[PDB]
């Protein structure tokens, strides 16, 4: 399990979604991803998690209406095709090739800052992008009181990793208590299902020796 894979929950990290520790050990074989991609500002988020003491997961409770939320692949494989356990690959309807302009928001009711993570999908080609999330220019915005940033997918061919030439870009912000995060998106979104809270203090290391 990769230390960042605890946030997204790829199949390797199914047993580490809500761990709690004083000492966290990363191993050289840990991969944070199943569907190829990488975290923006990865090390800062790793440094945050190493001294986090653990992760508590609270459902964010997004409901989606009249789109496809079963996105899956045989790269993230648990039973058959699957995906990241904490997230959802939002596709378009089989009936209509449209992705409606959606607005989804979350309020952090808790006393600790919330680790919100999400992905932006870079399809292999515009053909692939239009087939999954519908035609037209795709746009994803993220906003809070502190944080604001907007994202547009960059379709194109990437080197094969686990059979896929596409890439998912994972982004994250930290909601302060009582603040609100809002997602506008009409496609190319990997929405969070659950948020993440830090359990305490700990120390992370990197090693390859017996415990």
């Amino acid at each position: 399990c990769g230390l960042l894979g605890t946030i997204t929950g790829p199949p390797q990290c199914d047993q580490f979604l809500e761990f709690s520790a004083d000492l966290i050990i990363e191993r050289r074989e840990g991969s944070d991803v199943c569907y190829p991609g990488k975290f923006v500002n990865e090390e800062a988020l790793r440094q945050i998690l190493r001294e986090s003491g653990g992760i508590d997961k609270e459902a964010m409770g997004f409901t989606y209406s009249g789109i496809r939320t079963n996105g899956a692949t045989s790269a993230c494989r648990r039973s058959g095709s699957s995906f990241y356990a904490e997230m959802k690959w939002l596709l378009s309807n089989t009936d209509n090739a449209a992705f409606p302009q959606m607005t989804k928001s979350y309020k952090n009711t808790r006393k600790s800052p919330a680790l919100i993570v999400w992905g932006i999908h870079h399809s292999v080609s515009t053909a692939e992008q239009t087939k999954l999330y519908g035609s037209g220019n795709k746009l994803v915005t993220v906003g809070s009181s502190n944080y604001q940033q907007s994202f547009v997918p960059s379709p194109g061919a990437r080197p094969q990793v686990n059979g896929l030439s596409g890439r998912i870009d994972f982004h994250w912000l930290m909601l302060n208590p009582n603040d609100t995060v809002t997602f506008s998106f009409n496609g190319a979104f990997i929405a969070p299902d659950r948020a993440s809270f830090l359990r305490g203090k700990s120390m992370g290391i990197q090693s390859g020796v017996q415990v």
Epitope: T73, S74, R77, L91, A97, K131, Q160
Partner: antibody, heavy 125, light 111 residues
Framework: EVQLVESGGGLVQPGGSLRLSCAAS????????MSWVRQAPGKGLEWVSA????????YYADSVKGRFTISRDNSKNTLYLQMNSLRAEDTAVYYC??????????????????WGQGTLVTVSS | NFMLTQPHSVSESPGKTVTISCTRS????????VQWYQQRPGSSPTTVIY?????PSGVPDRFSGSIDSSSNSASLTISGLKTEDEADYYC?????????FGGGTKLTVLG
């Protein structure tokens, strides 16, 4: 040059078995999923089953599920299809078709790009 | 799943231009990729279109792919027919784990 070749076609009394084997060459066989397509004598195409590059995931069509078992050996660059409890309906010509992806059965199927020459399996008493 | 519907018979004169349509019963046509295979009698099928419009290397530029989301149809189109284009043309598309084949279309060059 990619080339596929099927062998094992014959005549079988209904209720019998037959193990078809497609032979692959000219591409990296382990990294491309494979599939079996059949064509009744004078009818359209009908996809039968498919198997991933690794060989772990195996996907069958409804009409043949449970009676057909697909398998592969990545070392022998060979494909297989075990046909059991055969019927008159299953009499057709069977092609092995190289899939364009590594994985089969995920959200998007780009078709096939190469087709073996075919083999005739005939089932009648 | 769903079913695809092509005409059984299409005919035209050499050098003219045909279109073979393929209509999908359920689900949009632009929700997955469509192929076009061709089968000259006595030979295995070969693929003349993939991803709804793309020609494999070695397919004459007279073949084109198309997708009409209004009619929920995918349409092959052959310009300047030759005598060697006489074959059967199957369209193909995809669903959850299901591979749907069209009925087949007999393309005749009027002699």
């Amino acid at each position: 040059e990619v080339q596929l070749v099927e062998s094992g076609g014959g005549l079988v009394q209904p209720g019998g078995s037959l193990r078809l084997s497609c032979a692959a060459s000219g591409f990296t066989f382990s990294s491309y999923a494979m599939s079996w397509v059949r064509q009744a004598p004078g009818k359209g195409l009908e996809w039968v089953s498919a198997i991933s590059g690794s060989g772990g995931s195996t996907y069958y069509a409804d009409s043949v599920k449970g009676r057909f078992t697909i398998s592969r050996d990545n070392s022998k660059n060979t494909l297989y299809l075990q046909m059991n409890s055969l019927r008159a309906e299953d009499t057709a010509v069977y092609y092995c078709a190289k899939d364009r992806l590594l994985w089969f059965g995920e959200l998007l199927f780009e078709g096939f790009d190469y087709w073996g020459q075919g083999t005739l399996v005939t089932v009648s008493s | 799943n769903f079913m695809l519907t092509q005409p059984h018979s299409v005919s035209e004169s050499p050098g003219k231009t045909v279109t073979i349509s393929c209509t999908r019963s359920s689900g949009s046509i632009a929700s997955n990729y469509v192929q076009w295979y061709q089968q000259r009698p006595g030979s295995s099928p070969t693929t003349v279109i993939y991803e709804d419009n793309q020609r494999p290397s070695g397919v004459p530029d007279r073949f084109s792919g198309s997708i009409d989301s209004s009619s929920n149809s995918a349409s092959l189109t052959i310009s300047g027919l030759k005598t060697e284009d006489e074959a059967d043309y199957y369209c193909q598309s995809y669903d959850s784990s299901n591979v749907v084949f069209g009925g087949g279309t007999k393309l005749t060059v009027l002699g």
